[PDB]
Ligand binder design. Sequence first.
Ligand SMILES: O=P(O)(O)O[C@H]1[C@@H](OP(=O)(O)O)[C@@H](OP(=O)(O)O)[C@@H](OP(=O)(O)O)[C@@H](OP(=O)(O)O)[C@@H]1OP(=O)(O)O
Ligand SMILES: O=P(O)(O)O[C@H]1[C@H](OP(=O)(O)O)[C@@H](OP(=O)(O)O)[C@H](OP(=O)(O)O)[C@@H](OP(=O)(O)O)[C@H]1OP(=O)(O)O
Ligand SMILES: Nc1ncnc2c1ncn2[C@@H]1O[C@H](COP(=O)(O)OP(=O)(O)O)[C@@H](O)[C@H]1O
Ligand SMILES: Nc1ncnc2c1ncn2[C@@H]1O[C@H](COP(=O)(O)OP(=O)(O)O)[C@@H](O)[C@H]1O
Lengths: 885, 885
Amino acid sequence: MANVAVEFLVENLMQLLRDNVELISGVKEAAESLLQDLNDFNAFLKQAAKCHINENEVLRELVKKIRTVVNSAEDAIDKFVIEAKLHKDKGVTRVLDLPHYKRVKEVAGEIKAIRNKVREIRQTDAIGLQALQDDDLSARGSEERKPPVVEEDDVVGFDEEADIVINRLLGESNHLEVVPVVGMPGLGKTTLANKIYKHPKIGYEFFTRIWVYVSQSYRRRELFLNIISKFTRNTKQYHGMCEEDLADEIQEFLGKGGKYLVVLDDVWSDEAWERIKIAFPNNNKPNRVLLTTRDSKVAKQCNPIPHDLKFLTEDESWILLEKKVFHKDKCPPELVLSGKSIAKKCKGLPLAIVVIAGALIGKGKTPREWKQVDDSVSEHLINRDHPENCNKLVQMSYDRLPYDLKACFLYCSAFPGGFQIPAWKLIRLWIAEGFIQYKGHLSLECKGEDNLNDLINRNLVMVMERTSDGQIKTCRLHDMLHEFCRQEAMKEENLFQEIKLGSEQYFPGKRELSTYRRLCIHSSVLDFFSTKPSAEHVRSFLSFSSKKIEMPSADIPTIPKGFPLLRVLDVESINFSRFSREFYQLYHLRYVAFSSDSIKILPKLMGELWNIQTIIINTQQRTLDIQANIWNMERLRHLHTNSSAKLPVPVAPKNSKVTLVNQSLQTLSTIAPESCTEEVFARTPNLKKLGIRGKISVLLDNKSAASLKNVKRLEYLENLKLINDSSIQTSKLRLPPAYIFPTKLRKLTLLDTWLEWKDMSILGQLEHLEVLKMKENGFSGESWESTGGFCSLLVLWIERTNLVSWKASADDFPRLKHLVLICCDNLKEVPIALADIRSFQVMMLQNSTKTAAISARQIQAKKDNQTQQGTKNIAFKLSIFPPDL
Amino acid sequence: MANVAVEFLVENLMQLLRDNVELISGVKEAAESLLQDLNDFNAFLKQAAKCHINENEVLRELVKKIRTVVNSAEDAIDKFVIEAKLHKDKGVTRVLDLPHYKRVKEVAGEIKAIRNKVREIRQTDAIGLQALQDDDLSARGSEERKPPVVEEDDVVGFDEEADIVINRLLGESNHLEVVPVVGMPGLGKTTLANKIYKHPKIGYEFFTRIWVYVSQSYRRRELFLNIISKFTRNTKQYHGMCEEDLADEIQEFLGKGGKYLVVLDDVWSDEAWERIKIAFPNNNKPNRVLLTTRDSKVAKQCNPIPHDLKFLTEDESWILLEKKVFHKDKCPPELVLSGKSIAKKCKGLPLAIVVIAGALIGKGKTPREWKQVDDSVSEHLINRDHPENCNKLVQMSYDRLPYDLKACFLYCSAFPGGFQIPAWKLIRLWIAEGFIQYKGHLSLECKGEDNLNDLINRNLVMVMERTSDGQIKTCRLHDMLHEFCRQEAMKEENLFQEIKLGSEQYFPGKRELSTYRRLCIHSSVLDFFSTKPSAEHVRSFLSFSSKKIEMPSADIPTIPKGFPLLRVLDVESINFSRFSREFYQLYHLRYVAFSSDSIKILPKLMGELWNIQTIIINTQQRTLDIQANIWNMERLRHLHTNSSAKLPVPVAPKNSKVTLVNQSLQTLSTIAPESCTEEVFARTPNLKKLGIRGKISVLLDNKSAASLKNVKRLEYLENLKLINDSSIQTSKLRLPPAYIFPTKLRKLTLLDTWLEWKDMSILGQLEHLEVLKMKENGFSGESWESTGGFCSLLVLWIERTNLVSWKASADDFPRLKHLVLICCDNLKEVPIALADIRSFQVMMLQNSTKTAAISARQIQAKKDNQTQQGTKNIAFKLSIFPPDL
Ligand SMILES: O=P(O)(O)O[C@H]1[C@@H](OP(=O)(O)O)[C@@H](OP(=O)(O)O)[C@@H](OP(=O)(O)O)[C@@H](OP(=O)(O)O)[C@@H]1OP(=O)(O)O
Ligand SMILES: O=P(O)(O)O[C@H]1[C@H](OP(=O)(O)O)[C@@H](OP(=O)(O)O)[C@H](OP(=O)(O)O)[C@@H](OP(=O)(O)O)[C@H]1OP(=O)(O)O
Ligand SMILES: Nc1ncnc2c1ncn2[C@@H]1O[C@H](COP(=O)(O)OP(=O)(O)O)[C@@H](O)[C@H]1O
Ligand SMILES: Nc1ncnc2c1ncn2[C@@H]1O[C@H](COP(=O)(O)OP(=O)(O)O)[C@@H](O)[C@H]1O
């Protein structure tokens, strides 16, 4: 929507005028006039939106040439901004310094020319309401959208096929065979496969099972690294092995553990199946593999008897539609007829129902809306096998979307098809692109998360992993939806443009690149940067590669000089040996994510990019030294980093009354313990997530417990993470008193701390803490006896600890929901009192002692009895990773 | 509720531990113990609340005494705090301050005794905790509540009485007669009176209408001065004029203006009517007085033909109850029988029905709850004449009320009965007393506002005036509810005790004053403070008087010495000429409201009190030079004042990296323009309401300090006020560009600005500004021609302007809903284009040109036709000051 670009330009111009006046002093008057006209045309575009746009070419023409003028104004303003900053760099004290000054205010003359063009547009419709405001539709208020709790986990109508396949399993013991699952894309084949892969009988028959995604454009070596990594604790030895040596290692590991079932999803081509099949040992075991392929030919090649997947019936279609739209409630009688008719028209494709239900929940719950959508679906689905019909359905659903969500939904497809998108990354990117403008009181991150939840609720985005606390971790768009979004954003809206090197595709030259606004490179990027490309009007650069691609020492200056107006730079997959001097002139940089392996310092000149919001640094070094003054940066909002980051000691200016209190800051992933001083925590009043990585002894030492004492000050802190790197238990550590931990702390994670289980009482004294995760021997001891306190704890996660005896009563954990017990090889028993917790929903046991498994089974039986006794107790599910335990 | 005391103690203790260790260094261990045992006691009390403590005697005792130890622990800890700060004052640099350290350690011995007493009882609490937890009830989550917009304004089945009354008037012209209104309390007589006082026929016949409240304890001169205040601005002169001569002036003012109606509200005794009737001239005109009384004898004396109020009929009862319970929505069929039975059981007393509706709202909307309510009401309403039936009904409603809200109703009674409680003051009290605890993310004030709105929704608190934008401005408790709340809070929970004295009675002695927690004095207070009283366990002192009482120069230091452990000091109605030293030693002070007339300098030592939230100062001086380092009082949240305060110039400490950035702050009501400086705004990042008073020119002048520019920094500001005191128009003032104003600004007010009507475009450019109030010639000029911009503006308020020609199109004010044209004696007419605005509902035209009023009637007729034309247009209301128009 043009509204988005207009609003972002307005906001950026206002910010420029307020904060830095000198930069805009030369042009400030033209800037202000442009800003007024921008507000006016934002209102104009809103009105034009009120009227049907896709049903009128004249309307689109009207809004057109506002977008072009806006882009020209944007580019002129940015070029002047950078030029004036270079003038400041020149530091020319001369009152009249014509060189570059004539031409810079002549860029201001480009700004004035575009200002005049904006004025001419204003003239064309001085009112802007001459004929358009006369018409307005969809006038209504906006209501609340609610959180996306897990629902309809039951798969409608796929149990019969699942049973058929699970019967197809173990047909001929002592042999390896592949079970083909065939169906048109979007028929739910991967849903059936996932259901089977988690079925209890499947888990019990095969001790080992693996899920592998074989994209249309997979790479074999990554795939084998992925498969092996599950079985091995370390992949270092195999990182230097060849594809075939890797296959042999996989065969060995996989034959170690008896039988096995491997699921290969979306095997596009026969050649891929042939290339991969070698790693599976036909070891004369009753082994199996389940493949999901959209093509009948490859399915026949794999096995002459493919399992043809069935369309859902009309009754099943209606059931799924109602389930999706009304969740746990029931469809009002007046809407039942329309819903059933729609489901009938769907033809039974689960994806079609899942999308139409999204459209319905988007629109509303009145019979008129349902009649309208029924008419639309009748019109658009006359044919059956044409793949464009689902595209038309997606068009229907996407039309109703709010424009702010339309921008985000489009931007989602920038990621390579089949990529698992880190939700936090996606949200920080949205914020960096300005798609989410401050609307109300919610913090930006919270608003973005809400956006993502609405997207998922509509079903326009699929969820892959949920963090322990249940929120979203990684999501991906469906293949057809990904294609739709790619085509839409690339053609209709020109949001971004992809450069995929096919067997024949050759790099577009400078002239085509001049038109692009955002680049995404997901194929060989080193070849692209050997071209020494150039583009002034590319603002964003995205590269979501699979491998990590070193940057040649000669091509490093290609990114800055190639694009000097960059805003979003997502180059995590690209190792940089160092940073050229032209990185310190990308002044329009908001988001900057990259990787490295030899970077030990962030040079102070990085402190000049005054605009940046996010910073991500994935460096292998153990110690990273941030010399760049994060405090000077006025808008820093995130500082993720793996290494231990040593923040610069704050230094209040001797003659300035500026308080360097960054009020926007919201994260500091792994600051070093040595920089948890009082000042650092003074400067981040609104800090919402903190983590430390280093020698936790300095902090937790009482003789030096002033540091976690300092952490007592971040009133808003909600996520604390303590990570110990020192491998020597040079002394014992004691947790300071419970009152020292900020009162809202909801999530704590401990790793290699070696604390006494007698300190669990302190964490019991915390009242809001809701997810506790201790890994790599966070707490040391053989006997632990729960003393209550965890009033609001929801997920308990113990991993790799030498605990032996655990004693607790039902009242120790009133609100426990998820219990994760990994690699506790030395715990004799699990207290049965836990069987008496109502919140206790799902239990997981992994690499644990046999007595623990026995006690867990007693707990399962006990909770089954409790539910059978009529008590409204939520369903219980137990999952021991090794079935034999 | 005990949980409230325990929670407040816990929070205060935790804060003391975190901030100041030296104060607690002596008894840190006992402090932390107390903290733990208090948390456990709070959990125990919650659990006991889950069960019905009243049902079991053992429970009543078990809950009992946990509170006493908590009260005992508070007294000892507070006394230690003050004694230790006194030690700091001594500054005894000796390593062992054996003299008087053994005194503060005597207090510490009290502390340690208390800690041991808590550990005891905690043991006694340990036993039986399981027996308590075995039982629970009302297991449910908490749902959202919604804002209380005006609803059910119409009065059920009362138009018969209204028309009968309006008929009674005009019986005998050229004569003065008073019409009695009789009925039991809460029967709605005031409702009927207000209905009549607003009826269009009444507003047309009598030009001069006056509404007067005559409490049980009125004071004649007070109301006479108020009546005079209606006709002329000031009352200070007549403050030097006798009551009978006041009455003469009232009679003259009233007789000059044609006919007159006056409503005397809630007349109790005959003598009061006799005394007050004097002011009304029987000048041989058709004038009437409408008195409402609960006694038949006074009514009969005033007239042998009293108007008995009628009970509501069963159908009327049910319609009223349904309207209250279900608001606009109709009753669900399954609850109709229960609702009708309940209404029938109320015997037609509107107050009983109203409280029952509140109770039903509190319970929910399930048939079981309605059956339970029906049973209960049948139980408690066997009798009719006994007034205690309504007390039982309010008790029934109260029991279902959350304890946070419960803490109110009872604290609401503290305000003197019949007093109009300023909502903002009430909320800041709430906060200061600690009744409102951080639960979530809403700013404290917002949580208070929602509490108050919920109280109104349950109908327990009746509202009196709303601000222009509609948010509540002034509420009070109904008489029956007030007596119920006062008795309850004084007896059951001992929240506070009133000291008001009867004839032949004496002020309670020091022994009695030793068992008080809060003092409310609403009668002679100078007499009380001439007793030289003394109490150590009084934390709050409230004095909501009528007249401003001075404090004798010899009797000043009674309060600081009478009570040294004060928190709330609400002495707004007591004029202090100076402050004693013993006042500065008060350290437990949160709230401090007081008046004055000669106080020009806020003392420096006043800045030592670390714990203050609010500050109110009604100094008559024009300037109030503040020298208290507000920057150092870390909990400061308001600095209300009326004169032009001058905040101290901030200075970041030379040798401390601690930034003096207050982030709780919310308002700096009336600072001086000289103190609208950069730093003063850097130090208050979260400021949410600013006002200025002084020579607005120095702001609008850029040479002194770009101060209205500096206002740009307060990203959260939402209420601005520019008050100009300079009466000399030295030069014209020009508003800065619209981008300077904070983006969220939602309310602006300009008095004496004398800005040129051309600038109104700048205020048009603002996008959220919702209420513009220009009073006493805000803008100077004679021709105003709207150019648009006020997209979101909702209320327009013009007072005392020389505007002659106003030109506008319907597109300039799309969202307008309220228009106020006060004292526009030079304006000719208002653009009829406003008649086309759908949102336009209410417009008030006071003391303006008759041509403007004719245009107003044209607008009214046009909107009448518009609504008649089938458009879903909201009802329109026209208010015109003089009847002839
Ligand atoms: O600390 P944990 O409870 O073990 O959770 C971590 C943490 O994420 P959260 O604290 O937000 O939950 C890490 O956060 P970052 O390091 O990315 O800031 C994240 O990443 P790492 O793997 O690099 O530690 C990691 O991911 P994973 O689950 O893959 O181990 C995992 O996140 P979740 O708990 O959200 O899944
Ligand atoms: O209700 P108040 O607390 O008395 O304040 C509001 C207004 O501010 P807001 O409109 O933002 O609420 C002014 O602010 P303050 O003076 O209270 O700081 C106030 O000014 P004055 O009291 O000096 O007149 C004015 O007073 P008034 O009610 O007499 O108009 C009154 O106006 P509203 O209640 O209509 O908002
Ligand atoms: N049996 C089913 N019940 C409900 N939804 C289903 C079912 N089968 C498929 N779907 C939905 O159909 C859509 C397409 O399936 P998906 O799992 O995304 O990929 P695939 O088509 O490869 O199976 C998704 O929204 C999926 O949840
Ligand atoms: N139809 C009605 N007639 C009278 N009061 C009504 C009616 N409907 C609701 N009420 C409410 O019942 C109460 C009537 O008594 P009230 O006016 O409070 O007492 P009093 O007349 O003694 O001041 C008010 O709260 C009023 O708003």
